[PDB]
Amino acid sequence: RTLKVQALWDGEAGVWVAESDDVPGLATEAATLEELLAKLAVMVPELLEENGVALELPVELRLEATRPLVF
Amino acid sequence: RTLKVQALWDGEAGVWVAESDDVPGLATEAATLEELLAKLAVMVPELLEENGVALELPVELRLEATRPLVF
Structure with a gap:
């Protein structure tokens, strides 16, 4: 379904x-978030196949970035 | 807590x-995700005060971007 x-x-x-608890052996980075997304689009499927997939389709990738808020 | x-x-x-269901009157965009984050860091607190906050602290902003995966 949704891979966080x-x-x-x-x-x-x-x-x-x-970093992902839903995607096995994920190790990747990029200078920008756009590039990180691009790279993920390719690598994640591959990693899911190479490993025991067991996914419900269609699968979507949710890239999350957290920022602390100051008040 | 966490504002998605x-x-x-x-x-x-x-x-x-x-776009946010946790943040009132949020209307903002940016050419890149980095800039969108920057802008959000400023606007979100403001919007939460201007409106009935009611938040548990410390509050963190979780920016989510979804991408469809092809197999």
């Missing part, structure tokens, strides 16, 4: 890093 | 558009 993937900002390395 | 905000890609207008 977190994008964590790594200021030191200047890149967003993908 | 969706970023919807508008290819025609060349911008990501913010």
Whole structure:
């Protein structure tokens, strides 16, 4: 169904890093969130096949980025 | 707590558009997801105050972007 993937900002390395509890062996990053999305679109299917898929279709990727709010 | 905000890609207008069921009167977009985040960091608090807040702290903003997966 929906595969939640977190994008964590790594200021030191200047890149967003993908992390997912729904996607096995996911290890990828990119300078921008757009590029991270692009890369994910390719890698995620592959990783799901290489591993025991077991997914309900059609599957969508939800890239999440969190920011702390100041009041 | 966590305020979920969706970023919807508008290819025609060349911008990501913010949409939120947790944040009142949210109307904003930006050419990139980074900029959309930046803009949100400022506007969201403001909109929450101007309206009946009623939030548990500390509050974090979760920007979500969905992409359909092809197999």
